[PDB]
Amino acid sequence: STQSVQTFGKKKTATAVAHVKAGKGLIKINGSPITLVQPEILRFKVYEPLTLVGLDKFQGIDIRVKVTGGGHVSQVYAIRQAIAKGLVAYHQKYVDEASKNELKKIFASYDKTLLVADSRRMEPKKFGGRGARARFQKSYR
Amino acid sequence: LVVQEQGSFQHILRLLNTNIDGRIKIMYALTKIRGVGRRYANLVCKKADVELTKRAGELTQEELERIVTIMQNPTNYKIPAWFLNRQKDQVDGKDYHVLANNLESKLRDDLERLKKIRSHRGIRHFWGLKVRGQHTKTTSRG
Amino acid sequence: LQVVELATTIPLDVQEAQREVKLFNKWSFEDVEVKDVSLVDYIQIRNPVFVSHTAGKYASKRFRKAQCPIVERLTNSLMMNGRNNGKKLKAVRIVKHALEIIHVLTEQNPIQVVVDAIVNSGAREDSTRRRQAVDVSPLRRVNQAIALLTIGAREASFRNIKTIAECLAEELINAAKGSSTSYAIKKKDELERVAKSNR
Amino acid sequence: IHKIRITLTSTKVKQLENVSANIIRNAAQYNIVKKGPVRMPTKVLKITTRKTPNGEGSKTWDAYEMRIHKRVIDLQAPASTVKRITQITIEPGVDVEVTI
Amino acid sequence: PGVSVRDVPAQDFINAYAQFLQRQGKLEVPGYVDIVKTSAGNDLPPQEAETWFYKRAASIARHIYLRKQVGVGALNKLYGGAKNRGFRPHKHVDASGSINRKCVQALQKIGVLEISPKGGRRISENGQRDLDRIAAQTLEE
Amino acid sequence: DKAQHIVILDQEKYDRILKDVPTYKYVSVSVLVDRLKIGGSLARVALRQLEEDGIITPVLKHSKQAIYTRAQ
Amino acid sequence: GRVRTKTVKRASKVLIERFYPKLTLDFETNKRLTSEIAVIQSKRLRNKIAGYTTHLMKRIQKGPVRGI
Amino acid sequence: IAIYAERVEERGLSAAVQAEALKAKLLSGLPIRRAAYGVLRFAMGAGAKGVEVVISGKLRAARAKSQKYADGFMIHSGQPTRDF
Amino acid sequence: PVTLAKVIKVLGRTGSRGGVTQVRVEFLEDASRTIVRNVKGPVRENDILCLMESEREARRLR
RNA sequence: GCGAUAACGAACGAGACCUUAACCUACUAAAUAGUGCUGCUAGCAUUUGCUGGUAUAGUCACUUCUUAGAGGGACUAUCGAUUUCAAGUCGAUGGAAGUUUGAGGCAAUAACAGGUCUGUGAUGCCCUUAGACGUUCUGGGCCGCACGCGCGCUACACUGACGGAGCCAGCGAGUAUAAGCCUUGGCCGAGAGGUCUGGGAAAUCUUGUGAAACUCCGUCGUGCUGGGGAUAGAGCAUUGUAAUUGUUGCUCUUCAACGAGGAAUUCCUAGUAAGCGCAAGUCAUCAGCUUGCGUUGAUUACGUCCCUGCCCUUUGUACACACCG
Questions:
Q1: Nearest-CA neighbor of E53 among E75, E70, E28, E78?
Q2: Closest listed residue to residue C17, CA positions, set C54, C48, C56
Q3: Chain A residues with CB inside 8 Å of E6's CB?
Q4: If you measure CA to C1', which residue is closest to nucleotide J220?
Q5: C158 beta carbon < 7 A from strand J?
Q6: Which nucleotide is nearest to I18 (CA to C1')?
């Protein structure tokens, strides 16, 4: 063992567990590289935590994030949050604090849900209708 | 691959037994024949070595006659006993895939069989009411 | 410039994206500006985004919706008539293909064409219930413009062999040039003509 | 020295926690090496039924619930001493099963 | 670089392996492939008459490779989909058992799959080699 | 049934298709259908052909949208 | 709205009458002080009372307050 | 099994005992108001914070009425009803 | 011609249903003039507003 | 609530409360959760690399993710403003969270000739009680069809249908000498289904419930068209003692109305609406229904008293069965 952190990312039921360790710049998704992550329209979502801070920050680290639960879109958001949080956590545990603050600042200035999870959850459904708020159609005479 | 080709393009709206339009792909043009569906026509067009990417107009008389033979003799070309129609014919017990005018002949035969014996289903065909036990209180207005 | 190597091969067009942020990695925001001084704050193009899908929380406050990227608002308004509610991947694909088709027809930045269609499409006076002529707020102008453009495109594509993206491109370019061929200018002309008589 | 397994389950959490603490103590001071406690995910038994005994009025519903909790501890010691520890440490609210 | 299946997109991998499996020749394509539907919930036979069995078998082999001990009922579940039930609402249905079982039996006689302990079928040593090499060729270009 | 389209590629039509398509800034299935009165199943294969034996160049490729510009 | 009911307001007034000298203008210190002094049946009520006590102590310093 | 018996700690703080006693005196022909106030006095003597007795049915008349007999302190909403 | 004006105060909601708001617009170039006008959508202060003809004052409507 | 005060002190309701959702690299632990390593080992390139299988005896370690007790956290905290400067309120900042943080359970007094005697071996009075209005068996009916109405499900297509490929949830349930539960895997069958095994009284097996919408690649080409699949003929299976008045499922064939719906009218303010499925209840068989659950995920308000109503005060009244006077 040399250097390793563990972080996570969430979008509503999906959870992406990332392992960031020293390595020659490998980024993986359930044992497959990020470059072919499904929906490709949303691939730039899992490219954002890379381009926005520069790939050089990922030279020394080797990250394998495991994503599970939720759905396709939710998993994409969970993966992006896990990767961003994991980079910040590694710069917390090993690298100096100035750099970690700089990365945290840039991540927040672009998007809040790279570091902080969206807290929205599905409202429970109540009797008397088919939804949380929606009610059965009402009739008269 | 696009092909320039002429002569063989007959838009003839006359095909086998009924006025099957030539502009429509062969898989579905055969569905105009009453007794032939998308899947029966698809399987017949397979057994007659006709590329389904060829339109009904583009065909010639050899394919037309092969289609007629394969449609009227389903077994002779390895059509299973479960894929055709009027299985275990009421008259003779054989498997008959019944077609255009025989289709009405056999429907008249089945219905008149039900009415002559005075079966409940035949009597309801006689009245014009639904026979398969559906409710008619609210939904048989039409 | 920024080329640097990883164990997993990274695509080269992605490496090009460190310098600036581009919509679908093809269109730039920083060359787009809003002609209408009134509508500058209700058409947000200052913060670049890679794709018109951010899952933002824009219904929380009252004007928080004005901070949504404008292409995302257009994308969301494509999601209508029941069968298309919720299908936002389809909507963002529609928008991406429409931006391509706009660039092909018009040798311009498609974001600029979208902004111009939106700024031209909105009625500046309207009527409220005998009905009385009133002015229209900038934010109402913007989202009436977006609703008009998307409704016009959706009406055109229905029962027509032409694709939704092509109808969207056609409507956007016609509005962006301020011609009566579009659905948005025609409706804007009706609304302002009616508001005229009510003064 | 047997790989004894005790399983605790009850509807009321205080007594179940008391029983788990009691066995942990009586396997500590009586020097036995122990491997818990382990809490199974809680089971929610839900009955949703109509409030009215006839069928009149607004369609309103009751959602009744009976929670069940389950904890397991593994003991490594002779059979009789763990048996006596289990036998002294009982409670009406919490039922037990000792298995090997 | 050590190439595996996980490094190549799925779609082009199933395409390449199906073209390979049909070029090779020994696969035991059954005689009813011109007559049958893939699923009871389907309505029409597969359009690609002369290739659908090969693409099914290729996708099946990739599925087996990526996992451990997956059987014919799970493939029935995988390849099923929504059924048009007329005026009733839609509902999942399973795919055809005979097709998937014959596919896995053909893959087994060509020595790609092999009966695993605990049940089911798992990819073979030479099956792993064949899939890996057909992945190496796809990503070479 | 209206719109009286064209069901096969024909010599005069093929002369039309070769002559007219280099004057289009944007070509697609719909553009061909509504400037040629051909059907869609012919327009798709014409776009593919002109892609191999180069007369039209693509900007984007998708199952539901084909975007094709001038070859030059 | 966030109007504080009679229970929190009366409890705060009693606390200030009894234990004014050992009570400060900080919510955390007053929270722990209320916890040790008062037998509050819920943590939410405890926090509400501590916060209103802080508000009153912060008002007093600028000048006297009625009731208290 | 083994069935034992133990008397109740406060006869007046047990609602079941009081309801059964009220049944008995009511079956015995004793007036309704007197029986209800007997329940109320007995329970308050046992130290209860409050007590309520409600009697419903047709009382001396064909129309059915509901007579309530309260004394002391009674809560109605929230979790504390299940407790106290 | 159309003129431009900036909202400097939001007087209040008007109309029977409350769908219109009283605003005191203030001309950009000619800063010495303030006109009261009715607006259909949501408006804040500093909202620049376009007036088709600025020589009209509004008081109320239902 | 501040306060005003011929009251003063109180009681209920509200709020507090309880359950649930969101935060915790902070405690306790985990062989029924997961992981880092380590054996033994696979393919692929040999840099010591990339992806895997395996080992609940590897006499290893651990708790980020999962589970759940025991706690922490939010109180409007800070800052600007405004207002009896009292109660409050509005913007920002920080924060997992700042609408009472989101959702519910609970819920006063007075009433209604509201519903239920067909839930009750809960009941007064009336009726009936051996050719019974008790009970049981056979068969039929509750489904019967000129027609009117209410809750709904499918649609009228290209923002699509079909075919291949990709491939992701959450809440739950489950038995034994049966009258028989959830079912993996193997084999047969186009299917539906049959058969033989094995696991699971269940964080252990079904089950990662590989769900559907969706994504990709093609086919179709603006027409009642490959939209729609009612009605009907023939055949194959399954449940049941019994499928005729099609129980249900499957296969071929048949291929209606419908081209977005007049006057009217319902529900809804954010993970909400809409779309999409899944599980449980009913249940031998049958879900177009309910109750929950997640997946995809918006447009528009954040306002008013115009309509429909509700609360409080003043006021008029020939009303009190109370303006349906």
A1: E28
A2: C48
A3: 31-33
A4: F41
A5: yes
A6: J304
Chain A residue with minimum CA distance to E10: A36
Cβ distance D47 to D4 under 8 Å? Answer: no
Provide the residue type at F49 as one letter. Answer: Q
Identify the H or E element spanning D63.
strand D61-77
**Residue A65 CA distance to nucleotide J215 C1' (Å):** 22
* Distances in whole angstroms, Cα of residue I36 to Cα of each of C131, D6, E57, I18, I32: 19, 81, 75, 17, 14
Q: Are strands I48-51 and I3-14 parallel, antiparallel or unpaired?
A: antiparallel
Q: Which of the 8-37 residues on chain E come under 7 Å of nucleic strand J at their beta carbon?
A: 10-11, 14, 32, 35-37
For the purposes of burial, counting CB atoms within 10 Å of the CB of A139, is it exposed (0-12), middle (13-18) or buried (19 or more)?
exposed
Backbone angles phi, psi at A16, to 5 degrees: -115, 115
Sequence letter at residue E78: L
Q: Are E113 and E57 in contact (CB under 8 A)?
A: no
Residue with tokens 């495991």: A66
Measured between alpha carbons, how far is F31 from E97 in angstroms, rounded to an integer? 45
Joined together, the tokens standing for residue B116 give 């002559």
**Interchain proximity C96–A35, CB inside 8 Å:** no
Q: What is the DSSP letter of C125?
A: E
Tokens of C50: 């890679």
DSSP tag of E31: T
CA–C1' span, H81 to J107, in Å?
11
Short-list C25, C21, C22, CA closest to C12: C25
Flag whether residue E45 sits within 8 Å of chain B, measured between CB atoms. Answer: yes
Q: How far is CA I35 from the centre of its chain?
A: 7
Alpha helices (H) along D1-100: 13-28, 79-88
Which residues of chain B have a CB within 8 Å of the CB of E44? Answer: 38-39, 42
Closest chain B residue to the Cα of F6, Cα to Cα: B23
**Number of helices and strands (H, E) in chain I?**
0, 4
The single residue listed with the structure tokens 């934010």 is C139
Q: Which nucleotides of J are covered by protein (CB under 7 A)?
A: 1-3, 11-18, 20-23, 25, 29-32, 35-37, 42-45, 47, 49-54, 64-70, 72-78, 86-89, 92, 96-97, 100, 102-110, 113-116, 119-120, 143-155, 157-173, 183-193, 203, 207-208, 210-226, 228-236, 244-247, 250-255, 257, 260, 266-278, 287-306
Q: Would you tell me how many other CB atoms lie within 10 Å of the CB of residue I23?
A: 27
Judge whether D67 and D44 are in contact, CB under 8 Å. yes
- According to the entry, how was the structure determined? cryo-EM
C-alpha to C-alpha distance for C87 and E87, rounded to whole angstroms: 24
| Min Cα–Cα distance to chain D from A8, Å | 22
Helix (H) or strand (E) holding A46: helix A43-51
Q: Which of residues 24-53 of A touch strand J (CB under 7 A)?
A: 24, 26, 28, 30-31, 38-41
In this structure, what token pair is assigned to residue E12? Answer: 């082009």
β-pairing, A27-29 vs A61-68, is: parallel
Half-sphere exposure of C43 (CA within 13 A, CB side): 28
Q: Which residue of A has its CA nearest to C87?
A: A73
Task: Provide DSSP, E63-82.
Answer: HHHHSSSB-HHHHHHHH-EE
CA–CA separation, I40 and I19 (whole Å)? 6
Q: Give C177-185's long-range contacts (Cβ < 8 A, gap of 24+).
A: C177/C116, C178/C120, C182/C117, C182/C121, C182/C149, C182/C152, C183/C148, C183/C149, C183/C151, C183/C152, C183/C153, C183/C155, C183/C156, C184/C117, C184/C120, C184/C121, C184/C145, C184/C148, C184/C149, C184/C152, C185/C120, C185/C121
Cα angle B99-B102-B106, degrees, rounded to a multiple of 5: 115
Is the Cβ of F8 closer than 8 Å to some Cβ of chain B? yes
